[PDB]
């Protein structure tokens, strides 16, 4: 074990030296020529009311109109964001839902949490109401995130420090991703859905290739638990929010932190991050009940989406980039433009 | 407009369903149940997946306890799910080299957690009979895990249990005073600690919770009126 520890230390030094050689400058020192976005006077256009407890999670539709939101009162509610109409209301067997996903085809939703189970609910039922279509059991830690790759293949992250890729039809784990030592709090599928980055409570964000299930890279630099992660829209970069009150954009192809978004008065942990459709704005939900829109290239705070009465727990940017949806522990989901 | 009418009909049905569900949700008090395995927490669960929901009721009042089993001992993330619960029933394993000090540290972490700073904590010193057996036999040797117990004295407000040895009373009230030292330090009335002396098979365990829950609710109302 001592020999393995020494080898691991030497490999860590080699990786650190390789990252240092590949990075003599940060994102800001290269993006001096890009135009600052100025103050983003983003404003609330809709407020989705009807959740009783703290929305712990929400997910948009691919149509960018319907969105699924999860409240820890035990509710999975689909909102027609345009007309603020609830499309479906799904009671949950486990009230403690910590994650929800909306299938890209829109036929299905997923939710999970302290039950460890990823419940897949079918929307387009012949019976006329949402039923428990499938249950994915097999995680031994709380289910912190879940994302559909398609109608049948879904990737989930759990508190058991492992991620699991499931075939929904059979209900069996197609692949198990392991290597995190902290509670894996979130994951994000790449635009090609071939790669996915998951941040854990070990201050490290691990990128996995879904097909074979190996941890391709382990980006480090965060000081505390990573609670939020999302790919940059090109799929060649991602961002993480951590309890250290700093967001960090990492390159996949540079294996290290590209930029850090932080401010001295910000001493609260980012709870949710999401890029705008172009990736110029990184929206991050903070515990101070506010969301900060960071100009992801100049790293300055472009705007503040103040208005939430409690901790911002989730964000989602529409696939067409028209609107943001921010949920919060105040039981309310504000749509912003 | 026909599609909008159908959508509005479905939305109104959903809204009336949610209004119906809100009555049940508000009438039911979510309670977190926390503690180590040796604390007798599962015994209290029996007396009353990665979470074990227990719906029970006192005087036609619904409590929904959540015994968090099948979860990693790294509590710092899923614990945040329980900020809005009525109370956290923290059961301690009094009688890990020093399990009691670990319980004290966990209670301190809960008390000073920025999300649980508004969440009340009921406290159960579960192993009172076993603590008595170990103190009277000299096997607990709490005095070495806590040197200040060599100078601690039974407080004037202490009410001994019927037939309880003075050493047992001194030990239990020392434990309570340690936990109240943690709680009162930076308590600030935003949340309240309710220590109790209980056995594993005590049927009072529900009432001591229920009353405290009532108290918590009452105090919350007063905090809403700026009366406290």
């Amino acid at each position: 074990l001592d020999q393995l520890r020494q080898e691991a230390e030497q490999l860590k030094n080699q990786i650190r030296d390789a990252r240092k050689a590949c990075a003599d400058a940060t994102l800001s020192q290269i993006t001096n020529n890009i135009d600052p976005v100025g103050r983003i006077q983003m404003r609330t256009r809709r407020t989705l009311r009807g959740h009783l407890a703290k929305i712990y999670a929400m997910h948009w539709g691919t149509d960018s109109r319907l969105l699924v939101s999860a409240s820890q009162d035990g509710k999975l509610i689909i909102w027609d964001s345009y007309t603020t109409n609830k499309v479906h209301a799904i009671p949950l067997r486990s009230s403690w839902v910590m994650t929800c996903a909306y299938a890209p085809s829109g036929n299905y939703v997923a939710c999970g949490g302290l039950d460890n189970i990823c419940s897949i609910y079918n929307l387009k039922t012949r019976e006329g109401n949402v039923r428990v279509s499938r249950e994915l059991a097999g995680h031994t830690g709380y289910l912190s995130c879940c994302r559909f790759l398609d109608d049948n293949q879904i990737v989930t992250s759990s508190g058991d420090t492992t991620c699991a890729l499931w075939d929904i039809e059979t209900g069996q784990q197609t692949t198990t991703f392991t290597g995190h030592t902290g509670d894996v709090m979130s994951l994000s599928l790449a635009p090609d859905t071939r790669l996915f980055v998951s941040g854990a409570c070990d201050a490290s964000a691990k990128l996995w290739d879904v097909r074979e299930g190996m941890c391709r890279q382990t980006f480090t630099g965060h000081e505390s638990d990573i609670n939020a992660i999302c790919f940059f829209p090109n799929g060649n970069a991602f961002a993480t929010g951590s309890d250290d009150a700093t967001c960090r954009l990492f390159d996949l192809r540079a294996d290290q932190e590209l930029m850090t978004y932080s401010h001295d008065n910000i001493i609260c942990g980012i709870t949710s991050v999401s890029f705008s459709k172009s990736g110029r704005l990184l929206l991050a939900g903070y515990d101070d009940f506010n969301c900060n829109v960071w100009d992801a290239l100049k790293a300055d705070r472009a705007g503040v989406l103040a208005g939430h009465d409690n901790r911002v727990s989730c964000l989602g940017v529409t696939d067409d980039g028209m609107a943001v949806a921010t949920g919060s522990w105040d039981s309310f989901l504000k749509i912003w433009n | 407009r026909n599609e909008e009418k159908a959508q509005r009909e479905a939305n109104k049905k959903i809204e009336k369903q949610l209004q119906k569900d809100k009555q049940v949700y508000r009438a039911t008090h979510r309670l977190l149940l926390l503690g180590a395995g040796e604390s007798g927490k599962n015994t209290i669960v029996k007396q009353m997946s990665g979470i074990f929901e227990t719906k029970f009721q006192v005087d036609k009042v619904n409590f929904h306890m959540f015994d968090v089993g099948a979860q990693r001992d790294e509590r710092r993330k899923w614990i945040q799910c329980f900020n809005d619960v009525t109370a956290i029933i923290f059961v301690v394993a009094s009688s890990q080299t020093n399990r009691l000090q670990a319980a004290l540290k966990l209670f301190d972490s809960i008390w000073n957690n920025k999300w649980l700073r508004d969440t009340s904590v009921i406290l159960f010193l579960n192993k009172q009979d076993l603590l008595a057996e170990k103190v009277l036999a000299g096997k607990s040797k709490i005095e070495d895990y806590f040197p200040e117990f060599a100078r601690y004295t039974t407080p004037e407000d202490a009410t001994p249990e019927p037939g309880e040895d003075p050493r047992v009373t001194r030990a239990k009230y020392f434990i309570r005073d340690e936990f109240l030292r943690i709680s009162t330090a930076s308590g600030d009335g935003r949340h309240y600690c309710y220590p109790h002396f209980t056995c594993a098979v005590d049927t009072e365990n529900i009432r001591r919770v229920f009353n405290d829950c009532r108290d918590i609710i009452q105090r919350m109302h007063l905090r809403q009126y700026e009366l406290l």
Partner: nanobody
Framework: QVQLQESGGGLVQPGGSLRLSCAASGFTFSNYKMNWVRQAPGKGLEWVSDISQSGASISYTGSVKGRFTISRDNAKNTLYLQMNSLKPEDTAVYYC?????????????????????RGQGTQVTV
């Protein structure tokens, strides 16, 4: 990467003295409350002592009250445990455990089996 390296542990005769030094790296040491915990042979990770962000607040487990002094040098980004009057039951692997979140008074999970922000541990045999 959050790294905590303990050093200075070693063989000490009973009733002797020793000094455990924790070198911290990969994080702003001043912002984090720090802890010493110990894994005794055949026992779970007992928590030994903790010190606040600035060092103004200090607490010990009972068995080391007065015996050991915890301290932190924020300038050198390091933590110290000056150990005195060592009894044989102090023989353990000492882990320098950082609290998870900065600026927070709570210190969840430092005694957990696989806590992340914890050092490799230094052996102290008495």
């Amino acid at each position: 990467q959050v790294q905590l390296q303990e050093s200075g542990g070693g063989l000490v005769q009973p009733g002797g003295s020793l000094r455990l030094s924790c070198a911290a790296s990969g994080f702003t040491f001043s912002n984090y409350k720090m802890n010493w915990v110990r894994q005794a042979p055949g026992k779970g990770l007992e928590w030994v002592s903790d010190i606040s962000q600035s060092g103004a607040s200090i607490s010990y487990t009972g068995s080391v009250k007065g015996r050991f002094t915890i301290s932190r040098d924020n300038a050198k980004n390091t933590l110290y445990l000056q150990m005195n009057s060592l009894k044989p039951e102090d023989t353990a692997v000492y882990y320098c455990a950082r609290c998870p979140a900065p600026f927070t008074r709570d210190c969840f999970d430092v005694t957990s089996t696989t806590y992340a922000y914890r050092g490799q541990g230094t052996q102290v045999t008495v």
